[PDB]
Amino acid sequence: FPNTISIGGLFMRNTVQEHSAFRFAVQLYNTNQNTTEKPFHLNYHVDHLDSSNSFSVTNAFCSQFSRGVYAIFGFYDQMSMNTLTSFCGALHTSFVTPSFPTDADVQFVIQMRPALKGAILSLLSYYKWEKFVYLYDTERGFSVLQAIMEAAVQNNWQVTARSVGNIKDVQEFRRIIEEMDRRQEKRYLIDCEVERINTILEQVVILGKHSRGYHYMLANLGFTDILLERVMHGGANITGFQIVNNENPMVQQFIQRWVRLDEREFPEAKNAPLKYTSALTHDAILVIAEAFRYLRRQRVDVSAGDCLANPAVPWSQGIDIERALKMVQVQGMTGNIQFDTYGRRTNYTIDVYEMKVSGSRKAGYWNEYERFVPF
Amino acid sequence: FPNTISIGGLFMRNTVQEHSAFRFAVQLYNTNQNTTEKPFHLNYHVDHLDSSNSFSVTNAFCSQFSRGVYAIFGFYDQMSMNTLTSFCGALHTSFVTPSFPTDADVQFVIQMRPALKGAILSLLSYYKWEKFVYLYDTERGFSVLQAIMEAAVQNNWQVTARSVGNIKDVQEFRRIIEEMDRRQEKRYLIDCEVERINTILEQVVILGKHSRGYHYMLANLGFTDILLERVMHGGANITGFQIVNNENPMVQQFIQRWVRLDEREFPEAKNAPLKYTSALTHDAILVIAEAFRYLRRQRVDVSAGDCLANPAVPWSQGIDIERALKMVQVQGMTGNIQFDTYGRRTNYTIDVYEMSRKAGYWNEYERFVPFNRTIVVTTILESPYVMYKNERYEGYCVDLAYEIAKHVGIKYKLSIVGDGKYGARDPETKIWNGMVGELVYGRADIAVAPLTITLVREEVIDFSKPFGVATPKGSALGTPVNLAVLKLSEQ
Numbered sequence: 001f002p003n004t005i006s007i008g009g010l011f012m013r014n015t016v017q018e019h020s021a022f023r024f025a026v027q028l029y030n031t032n033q034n035t036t037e038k039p040f041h042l043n044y045h046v047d048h049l050d051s052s053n054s055f056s057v058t059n060a061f062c063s064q065f066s067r068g069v070y071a072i073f074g075f076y077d078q079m080s081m082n083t084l085t086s087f088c089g090a091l092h093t094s095f096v097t098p099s100f101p102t103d104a105d106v107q108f109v110i111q112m113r114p115a116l117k118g119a120i121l122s123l124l125s126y127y128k129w130e131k132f133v134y135l136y137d138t139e140r141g142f143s144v145l146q147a148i149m150e151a152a153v154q155n156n157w158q159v160t161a162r163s164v165g166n167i168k169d170v171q172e173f174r175r176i177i178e179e180m181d182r183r184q185e186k187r188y189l190i191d192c193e194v195e196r197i198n199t200i201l202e203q204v205v206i207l208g209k210h211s212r213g214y215h216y217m218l219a220n221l222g223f224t225d226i227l228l229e230r231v232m233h234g235g236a237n238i239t240g241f242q243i244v245n246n247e248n249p250m251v252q253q254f255i256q257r258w259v260r261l262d263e264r265e266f267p268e269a270k271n272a273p274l275k276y277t278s279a280l281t282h283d284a285i286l287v288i289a290e291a292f293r294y295l296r297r298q299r300v301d302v303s304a305g306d307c308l309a310n311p312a313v314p315w316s317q318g319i320d321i322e323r324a325l326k327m328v329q330v331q332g333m334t335g336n337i338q339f340d341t342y343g344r345r346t347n348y349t350i351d352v353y354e355m356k357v358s359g360s361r362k363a364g365y366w367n368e369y370e371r372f373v374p375f
Numbered sequence: 376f377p378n379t380i381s382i383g384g385l386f387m388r389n390t391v392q393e394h395s396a397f398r399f400a401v402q403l404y405n406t407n408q409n410t411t412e413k414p415f416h417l418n419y420h421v422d423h424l425d426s427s428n429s430f431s432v433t434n435a436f437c438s439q440f441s442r443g444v445y446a447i448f449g450f451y452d453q454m455s456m457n458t459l460t461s462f463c464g465a466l467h468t469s470f471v472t473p474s475f476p477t478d479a480d481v482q483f484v485i486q487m488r489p490a491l492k493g494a495i496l497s498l499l500s501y502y503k504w505e506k507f508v509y510l511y512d513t514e515r516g517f518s519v520l521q522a523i524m525e526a527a528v529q530n531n532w533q534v535t536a537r538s539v540g541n542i543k544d545v546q547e548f549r550r551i552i553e554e555m556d557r558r559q560e561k562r563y564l565i566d567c568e569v570e571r572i573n574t575i576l577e578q579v580v581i582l583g584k585h586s587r588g589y590h591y592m593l594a595n596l597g598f599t600d601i602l603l604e605r606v607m608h609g610g611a612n613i614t615g616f617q618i619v620n621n622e623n624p625m626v627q628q629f630i631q632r633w634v635r636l637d638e639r640e641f642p643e644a645k646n647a648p649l650k651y652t653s654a655l656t657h658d659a660i661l662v663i664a665e666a667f668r669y670l671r672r673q674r675v676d677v678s679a680g681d682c683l684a685n686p687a688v689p690w691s692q693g694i695d696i697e698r699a700l701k702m703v704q705v706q707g708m709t710g711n712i713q714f715d716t717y718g719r720r721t722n723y724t725i726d727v728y729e730m731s732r733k734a735g736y737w738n739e740y741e742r743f744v745p746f747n748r749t750i751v752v753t754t755i756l757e758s759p760y761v762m763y764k765n766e767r768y769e770g771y772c773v774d775l776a777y778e779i780a781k782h783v784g785i786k787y788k789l790s791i792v793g794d795g796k797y798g799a800r801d802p803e804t805k806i807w808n809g810m811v812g813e814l815v816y817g818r819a820d821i822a823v824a825p826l827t828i829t830l831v832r833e834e835v836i837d838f839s840k841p842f843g844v845a846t847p848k849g850s851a852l853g854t855p856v857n858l859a860v861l862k863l864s865e866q
């Protein structure tokens with residue numbers, strides 16, 4: 001086993017807090033004084049992507065690959081998903097990511113962002129949403145959209161689906177909302193980005209659609225990031241989902257030790273709310289450390305060239321590392337962390353917040369086996 | 376100047392006829408004996424790549440780059456567009472493509488497909504389309520969609536835009552068409568792929584919307600690949616766009632030589648109609664030949680390593696090759712061929728077909744040179760209001776509907792609700808049932824029936840004065856029906 005484990009980091013734009021969480025988690029692992037908890041020193045090579053120039057993304061990935069790396073933690077969007085996923089799958093290099101899970105079942109990628117599809121379907125069945133308006137964009141994949149369509153077909157729902165990803169003018173949102181209200185539509189499932197959700201909520205506030213007779217289900221982890229101050233005052237239902245628990249002791253101690261770091265080495269940390277992606281980054285560091293500790297425990301022999309070496313020969317140990325990254329069962333800031341054969345999270349819990357009352361109240365939780373437990 | 380010029384080629388799925396056209400055009404260039412338009416041999420490398428796997432695309436591009444090429448002809452999809460465009464613009468290697476033009480301004484990309492936004496806007500202005508349904512797909516870019524949106528905002532149009540690129544169930548197409556027909560939409564602008572256009576058109580044929588009075592504008596240069604026999608047999612108007620004119624002598628010569636090619640060596644020839652992408656491939660070969668002939672005539676110096684070598688070394692001769700390729704002006708099978716600073720085609724002509732006959736032609740400078748309702752009445756089977764005997768029913772409400780229609784002057788058709796209920800909102804699902812549900816959800820236009828004027832219903836539909844007669848809220852029949860009810864109450 002190597003005396004030092006080096007990993008890579010691929011950070012796209014607007015990931016300052018995620019970068020700070022990555023550095024802080026690596027430092028937390030490194031400063032542990034227990035030889036059993038720290039059998040190897042962990043280093044990282046951090047590079048920043050463009051995500052619009054595939055040449056730049058490939059250059060950064062190949063610079064990471066040329067130097068010795070055992071795993072790559074990073075982020076991708078819809079424009080850089082395919083390049084990184086394909087390169088990692090072909091070169092047998094594990095890619096640990098907090099980004100949206102891939103629609104296709106692909107290997108050598110560990111996406112520890114739980115899928116909202118099951119929770120969304122369970123809440124739709126529980127609330128009995130047999131007719132609603134589904135406003136979606138395709139910036140996080142098509143899994144939720146396909147699941148909604150299949151559920152509507154099998155359950156004979158009345159789902160009015162609208163793709164709002166390509167809308168640049170707010171009057172289009174106003175027209176959509178007015179048309180929906182003309183048809184007496186009271187229930188909206190908004191599977192969009194945080195900024196698009198904010199724009200839609202501004203439009204519904206402007207049109208006065210935030211009254212007590214409307215329900216908005218925001219299908220987006222990061223409930224604390226959406227601006228809901230002005231929609232609460234109208235009395236409308238707002239269902240949200242989260243994976244970070246504030247009263248979790250591990251989350252509590254991380255926050256306690258995390259809000260007292262100077263904003264010169266860890267920017268966007270102290271005077272800023274903790275995004276769920278930072279918790280996923282901390283959990284990713286935990287998963288990597290646990291997997292490599294297990295590899296050392298079993299005495300598995302793990303120890304580059306260039307990306308494009310046609311005929312490409314993958315390095316043999318990589319598969320083992322993938323297995324080590326997929327058999328872990330760890331407890332992190334998002335709760336239980338386990339992965340299936342495709343790298344997707346399994347046996348996870350998603351907290352559901354109703355927050356219709358003044359403030360935020362956690363209406364219940366969702367689990368794969370016991371579907372939805374309300375309070 | 377080298378005795379031979381080597382070019383790369385990147386082909387994908389459903390690109391057999393285009394590959395045959397590429398090979399045949401290269402053979403035609405190499406088989407000339409004048410020695411003036413053929414001063415050098417033309418060698419080609421060909422790679423078939425899977426666009427869904429970026430690793431394979433990068434492998435193919437880098438293999439061709441390392442082999443040594445002066446330009447890459449080929450196709451890109453919405454997934455492989457970014458990779459190929461970035462790799463060509465960063466390594467200063469020209470990419471000649473007959474695929475969709477890039478929305479953004481990029482360098483070292485020579486796009487052989489002319490843009491359709493100008494022709495579509497001019498045809499919309501000519502036909503006076505103040506209100507239409509735009510079904511878009513966004514598999515050839517977003518330029519047309521944003522152009523339509525800006526034109527609608529500036530000209531105060533009523534465009535009902537729907538994205539049909541994520542639809543896999545034909546019932547969704549049926550529901551969209553039914554919803555558009557309910558709101559009295561006659562004109563459709565379908566900017567989608569050929570297969571999606573065919574699916575939409577067959578759904579239209581099944582729904583019987585292909586009759587007279589309906590206009591369908593197909594925003595795709597694939598008019599010959601669209602199955603629309605039944606659509607035009609119904610009497611509807613179909614406006615199409617083309618770039619290949621069969622009356623062009625060069626096109627005729629190419630076709631007469633093309634239909635006599637051995638299918639073993641040249642698959643998809645003399646078996647299927649010549650796709651416009653094959654014509655663009657032939658014209659791209661002509662463009663490459665003319666540009667390199669210009670380079671040789673001007674005595675411009677012309678000459679590798681791996682793609683990914685930090686810091687990247689741009690090709691010194693790439694700028695000259697791109698400049699020569701972007702100043703070419705040739706008469707190809709698609710007409711005049713010229714390129715602007717960003718590689719997009721300029722000064723082109725688009726033939727507009729009204730159907731088939733050539734309605735006219737669109738050019739950038741000379742813009743475009745050319746050459747009642749059956750209202751649904753919903754009722755409920757309840758004596759003596761509606762009783763089985765439009766001729767199948769009699770009762771008070773049938774006579775009331777007849778009188779109201781005579782005062783309004785409309786043609787109607789009675790239809791009793793399936794569930795046989797009045798309006799009621801389920802507290803759990805918030806769904807209205809009965810006649811009020813039909814009116815709210817747009818499946819009916821008026822409800823002459825014993826429907827009590829209540830507060831809960833009044834908030835969702837318009838009630839005339841008691842006789843009340845219900846109407847969907849905000850419709851154009853509210854005041855006429857209210858006045859008719861009042862006048863009938865007068866007598």
Ligand SMILES: *[C@@H]1O[C@H](CO)[C@@H](O)[C@H](O)[C@H]1NC(C)=O
Pocket residue numbers: 186187212213214215237356
């Ligand atoms: C809002 O929530 C309340 C309490 O859960 C529920 O009774 C009401 O029907 C909801 N409104 C909707 C779903 O429009």
